[PDB]
From a paper:
We describe cryo-EM structures of the neck, the neck-capsid and neck-tail junctions, and capsid of the [name]. The tail to capsid junction involves a symmetry mismatch that is bridged by the neck, and is therefore crucial for the assembly of tailed phage. The extensive network of disulfide bonds within and between neck, collar, capsid and tail provides an exceptional structural stability to Milano.
A 3-fold symmetrized map focused at the neck-tail junction was used to understand the interactions between the collar and the tail. Namely, the head-proximal end of the collar interacts with the β-sandwich domain of neck 1 (gp14), while the tail-proximal end of the collar interacts with the tail sheath (gp20). The collar subunits n (Cys19), n + 3 (Cys19), and n + 4 (Cys23) form disulfide bonds with tail sheath subunits Sn (Cys467), Sn+1 (Cys467) and Fn+1 (Cys244), respectively, thus linking the collar to the tail sheath by nine (three in each of the three asymmetric units) disulfide bonds.
Author numbering:
A (entry chain F): 1 to 12, 18 to 230
B (entry chain q): 253 to 348, 360 to 378
C (entry chain p): 4 to 89, 201 to 347, 363 to 498
D (entry chain Aa), F (entry chain AV), I (entry chain Ae), J (entry chain Ad): 3 to 130
E (entry chain G): 1 to 230
G (entry chain q): 442 to 498
H (entry chain s): 379 to 498
The structure:
């Protein structure tokens, strides 16, 4: 659990510009707590509010080699798919595929064929979305399947970004001025990449007005811990 | 332990493991001497010298000059600079009369952390 | 050949280089498109070989960096910002993007346009601000014109050394300017105490001006320039300050030596204070325990004072009332305790440039027997 | 007023002049009621005849007894390391001594050492 | 929060007047922040035994270094319930259209609606149902930031005009004075359109009061430095 | 914390410097409450002028009182036998010494001797 | 100095891992006091690669 | 850059190169202590400064034969150790980086007489 | 560290002028607190009249007391072999002397000799 | 303070008389309590018989011990460089000397040298 303290804005780790540092390993889902106690306590009021805003920007991305793919099968019916038209294998190289058991399916089982073929049998009595993470010759990508409840269809979810912050897992403790949130890292994040997360937290005075505060953290996707 | 290994880079470079108990004198495929002789000479000299004092690095010209080899003087070596520099990173006992240098053993890596 | 073994490995190369470069002067000037290089892009140029088809043949920048490339033989890391062309003087330049945190000690701007000079001034003063990231840059610019104009065409900026030139000066102005800066850098970029004046320490090598009888600024004009500011040639390597916030006399920030030594003290104290990181600083009971690395605000002030009592004479001069010149106040001390937060401190010192020699009025009065 | 005499904090920083390692600043505790003794004027005087005096150069000395910290080796107190010491009395006075050196070490039993430190100059703060 | 102690205007000085003073206290600001400032007149108004301060403070914003913006601002209008469409290409007078990347930073997006950016300098603003007022959003054309206001009437006639918020400002009525402890509180909001490196000057004229109702005026200044990452 | 000062074990090994016969290591018992003293640094200092100091070479010493063991001749304590000593305190510290030499013998009474051991270097083992 | 190089941290390399505690009084057999020490042979001379730079006045 | 103009210059360059080599052959597997620089009584070794000393000594000695009168010798000779000129954690123990100038000697030329037969 | 007047390393290399054998470079240790003394200027001066001086040629001298190493014969210190000496102080100074010759040997007891070395020139290194 | 005897300031300027390079004027510090000695009259006298005296020509002499400055080589103190010296005492007197020449060089240890300067004439500045 990361624990950071905010500057109380008195002109009183600059690193490169201002933003802090957060190491991260591909696949992990960690938690971060930032204490606005230093900044919001002198402003005697009603503490923070639940109006945080997060934004992710990449200053080092290393564009992905493999690509992703979608799927819209039905309930109970088996699904078939290929894994050869994903990796463009520019220079002549073995196309050895692999399905990591750490990041396999969630409500089914795959059957990796001999040449990039796979058979996805969804769990009986199950309708929704599922993902899995393949590794085509060291480079990792994801395959998403949408199992539909045999009526018509199911919408298309967004392919998860390398570094993300979950939709609704943030919280604020106005009695201690602490913001809790989660940092999710895709297994497809390439080591060495560096992303930037910017936060805009709003405190409130005893009359219902607002006090804005902006900060960053540089998330370094590093391998081996 | 002292032993030889003869042939062309490929073989000699791939005919040696992380065995630290042996010094594998590398010999070119054109080496115009009987390997046995040179290997024996090397081992013998090392032994004779390091009886009272072990620290002495048997290398270079002065101390490490295999006396009884009387190699026929020539104008072209076997292993050239490249392939030498190559199997000096890879532990071998390259010999240039002919003197010995880089008197190391075929030890490159502990259990996995190579350096 | 006694080198076969492999012990010694020698490279007999005439054009070797060992120096730790430093000394990162920047040159700015318009260009001709002959120079095959991206404009508006800082380029740490090498020595001559990569020339005119790198910055623009013929144009001002060519001669400027030629003089600079001249002068100093070794010691600097020349940097060039080849601005592009367009009562024309294409100078517009708010470009803190192209030139940024990578910081340059000396600056030379080969353009008499007031606006460009003032923009460079602003950029330097921004760098020289209380902002925690510091590099302490200094610039050098030229200014021709008549006495009235030269006086009028000036300011208070002490971050430049605006050079004055009469409207008779044979050599093309910017030329000398470059040389000036060049010399200074390569000379002082290790010893800041040195001051570039007189004849031995400061004579511009690459000038070769044609000799005459009528010099230029007459004695009166010389006094005007000197007192007011400008560095009329070289002699009097001051930076035009003449004033302060409200009260005019501020002798301290007059000499360039003072400015370089002040930057030196700044970087020294910055690289020194960092041994107070971590530490743990008790500020309520003021009683560090037994066996825990820690310090108290009073102890910190003591340390700071001790430090400032060693560099004296070499960086500072005497520190008249040490009890008042160096003050360290904690956040809680000044602010009545509602808005106080442990960790914040305020240090304030009193810079006094080491007094140097100056005019020695002589009054020899002969007599007999 | 003159708040009661006594020491409150003793900070010591060890620096080995062989491996260039640094330890500290570690605090210590007084072993007894004896107080550390000081001498700031770096010039001794010698009595000549008829009021005169021969003013020569000398050192700034310091006498400090402290209980050994069971993590720092004892040799670091017997003069195997450069010490940076700082004392603070109750009345506010704080005295700093940097890059000093232990001179003429005395036998110690292992729990209470008495360092005779010599240095170029000691600074006083003179509480407000 | 900034906390400043005013000069006493009595004899000797304070705060580094050692070698004079920059003459203005300093205030570091980051584009987008809204902070709070407290000024304590206890040093000046306490010796003036009376009724402390009054609610008659007046402010002034003056820029000493502005670096005028590249992208101009614009104003839009629409009725309630009806969707608004707009352009984003005529607000960037440029010497070249090199790779203009219209971008809507989510941190300063709309307040009571949603915006769908088009492919080339177009945008669709759908105001929230059952809502009428003023709504802004900050766009970024090629790094250069500007604002677009699409204030919505309830289809009666129109809202007159928003004042096109300045880079640095002090809100109209969020100030207060405590005559018991001689402290004035006021909030400082800086728009996200402020350029890093700019310098403004805010001057404060605060009036106290004696025991009989007369006046004692005091004037101070503060230099606001807009620095990114701070 | 700092558990009670005091000694727990004292080991001594005698080697006659003529016949090279070795005896020990034998234990011993303190005769009173006093403790052995130490000096580890093999470099004494001398107070020069203006803060400087002359660092010369010297010997690590150790002063240790023990009760004579009634099976070892008294000559072996008076400086006629090379000694190797080891002390261990309650707090966990241990001080070892090899190839010591009893220097400056002091007249004793036959049941309590005070040996002034001098050795090249004394080694510590600062408690865990 | 002669047999090996200066220990970086002597209180880590040396370790006299014993087992005496296990040994019960109902038997006499002593002697398992294994010792494990690290090794870094004394550093020697090797390539001293030089770079001469001829010039003139 | 007539540094390599004179043939003799290049020849003596090669000569002094191989001579410097044969000098820096004594500093073979002879131990070098670079972390404590306190050679213990009996040991046979050196350390960076104790070698820089000998190098400067040899340089001074050979002045007049191969080299000329050196400039500020504290600049010419430099004996940077391995892990001082390399990526932090990379430098192998026991490698040095010595680097030196030459300034070959001077000889005689350029006699420009200005005879003046002027009269009496 | 700075401000420590003392010797740290003394290297000596013996070469027999009879059999051309070489021994060293062997380290040595100071026998007492006295330091080796030096004279670099190879030109002695003599006081003439009225401010003048007669500058004549002379040698570079060195006075070095060291403990005899029990492996090198004593004769090599009494002026029967060519010596190559090299000293280093604590403040960084290192003085090198090659092909010296021990002049005017003095009586010794076998454990501490005092060599008066004479040579053509001594070089200093002047710590940075 | 109008009484205290002793030296206050010492300035020295070196000029090596082969390369004709000048260094200084650099300050210095006394190594001990002793003070420099002087002799200004360049005419020594020799006692004849019956109240007469033979007046011959000689040198202005000066004896001065200083701590070697770690940026000037030791040779410049041993007499391989012309020196220009200035001493200023507490009582206000100053003694200046130009074109000095270190005569009869004495063996030094590298940190404290004793120069015997000989010059044509020494100047005073008898305190007001």
């Amino acid at each position: 659990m990361y624990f950071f303290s905010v500057d109380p804005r008195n002109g009183a780790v600059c690193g490169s510009c201002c933003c802090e540092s957060i190491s991260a390993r591909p696949g992990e889902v960690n938690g971060v707590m930032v204490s606005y106690a230093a900044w919001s306590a002198p402003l005697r009021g009603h503490g923070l509010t639940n109006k945080t805003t997060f934004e992710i920007d990449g200053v080092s991305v290393t564009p992905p080699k493999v690509s992703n793919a979608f799927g819209r099968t039905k309930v109970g019916v088996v699904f078939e798919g290929t894994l050869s038209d994903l990796f463009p294998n520019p220079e002549g190289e073995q196309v050895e595929y692999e399905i990591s058991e750490l990041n396999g399916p969630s409500n089914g089982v795959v059957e990796l064929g001999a040449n990039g073929a796979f058979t996805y049998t969804p769990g009986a009595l199950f309708t929704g979305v599922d993902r899995f993470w393949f590794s085509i010759n060291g480079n990792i990508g994801e395959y998403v399947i949408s199992v539909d409840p045999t009526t018509s269809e199911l919408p298309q979810p967004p392919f998860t970004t390398p570094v993300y912050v979950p939709a609704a897992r943030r919280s604020v403790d106005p009695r201690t001025h602490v913001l809790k949130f989660v940092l999710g890292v895709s297994p497809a994040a390439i080591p060495g990449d560096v992303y930037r997360l910017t936060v805009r937290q709003v405190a409130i005075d005893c009359d219902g007005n607002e006090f804005v505060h902006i900060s960053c953290y540089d998330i370094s996707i590093g391998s081996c811990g | 332990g002292y032993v030889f290994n003869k042939g062309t880079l490929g073989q000699v470079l791939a005919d040696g493991d992380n065995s630290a108990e042996l010094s594998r004198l590398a010999l070119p495929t054109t080496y115009p001497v009987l390997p046995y002789l040179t290997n024996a000479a090397y081992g013998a000299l090392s032994a004779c010298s390091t009886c009272n004092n072990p620290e002495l690095n048997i290398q270079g010209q002065t101390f490490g000059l295999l006396s009884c080899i009387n190699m026929p003087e020539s104008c072209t070596p076997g292993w050239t600079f490249g392939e030498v520099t190559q199997l000096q990173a890879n532990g071998f006992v390259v010999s240039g009369s002919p003197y010995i240098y880089n008197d190391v053993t075929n030890y490159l890596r502990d259990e996995k952390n190579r350096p | 050949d006694a080198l076969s073994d492999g012990f010694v490995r020698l490279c007999i190369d005439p054009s070797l280089n060992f120096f730790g470069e430093g000394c990162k002067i920047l040159v700015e000037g318009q260009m001709t498109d002959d120079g095959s290089a991206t404009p508006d892009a800082v380029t740490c140029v090498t020595s001559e070989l990569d020339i005119i088809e790198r910055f623009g043949q013929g144009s001002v920048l060519t001669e400027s960096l030629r003089k600079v490339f001249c002068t100093c033989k070794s010691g600097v890391s020349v940097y060039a910002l080849p601005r592009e062309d367009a009562s024309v003087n294409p100078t517009p330049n708010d470009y803190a993007t192209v030139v940024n945190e990578c910081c340059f000690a000396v600056y030379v701007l080969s353009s008499d346009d007031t606006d460009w000079q003032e923009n460079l001034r602003d950029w330097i003063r921004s760098a020289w601000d209380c902002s925690k990231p510091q590099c302490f840059g200094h610039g050098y610019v030229f200014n021709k014109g008549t006495l009235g104009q030269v006086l009028a065409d000036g300011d208070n900026s002490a971050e430049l050394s605006r050079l004055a030139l009469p409207t008779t000066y044979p050599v093309l102005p910017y030329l000398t300017n470059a040389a000036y800066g060049a010399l200074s850098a390569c000379s002082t970029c290790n010893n800041p105490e040195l001051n570039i004046q007189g004849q031995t320490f400061g004579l511009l090598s690459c000038i070769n001006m044609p000799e005459s009888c009528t010099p230029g600024w007459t004695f009166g004009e010389v006094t005007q320039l000197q007192a007011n500011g400008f560095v009329v040639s070289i002699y009097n390597d001051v930076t035009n300050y003449l004033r302060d916030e409200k009260n005019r006399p501020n002798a301290t920030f007059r000499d360039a030596s003072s400015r370089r030594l002040a930057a030196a003290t700044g970087v020294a104290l910055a690289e020194f204070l960092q041994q107070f990181n971590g530490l743990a600083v008790f500020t309520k009971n003021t009683n560090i325990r037994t066996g825990i690395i820690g310090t108290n605000p009073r102890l910190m002030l003591g340390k700071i004072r001790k430090w400032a009592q060693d560099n004296v004479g070499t960086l500072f001069s005497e520190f008249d009332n040490i009890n008042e010149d160096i003050q360290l106040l904690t956040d809680f001390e000044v602010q009545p305790k509602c808005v106080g937060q442990p960790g914040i401190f305020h240090l304030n010192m009193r810079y006094r440039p080491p007094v140097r020699g100056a005019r020695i009025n002589v009054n020899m009065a002969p007599a007999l027997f | 007023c003159n708040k009661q005499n006594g020491v409150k904090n003793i900070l010591i920083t060890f620096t080995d002049c062989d491996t260039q390692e640094v330890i500290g600043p570690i605090s210590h505790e007084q072993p007894d009621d004896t107080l550390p003794t000081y001498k700031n004027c770096a010039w001794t005087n010698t009595a000549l005849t008829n009021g005169y005096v021969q003013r020569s150069a000398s050192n700034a000395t310091m006498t400090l007894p402290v209980v050994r910290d069971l993590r720092v080796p004892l040799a670091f107190y017997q003069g195997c390391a450069q010490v940076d010491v700082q004392v603070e009395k109750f009345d506010g006075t704080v005295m700093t001594l940097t890059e000093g050196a232990v001179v003429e070490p005395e036998e110690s039993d292992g729990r209470s050492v008495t360092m005779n430190i010599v240095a170029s100059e000691i600074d006083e703060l003179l509480p407000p």
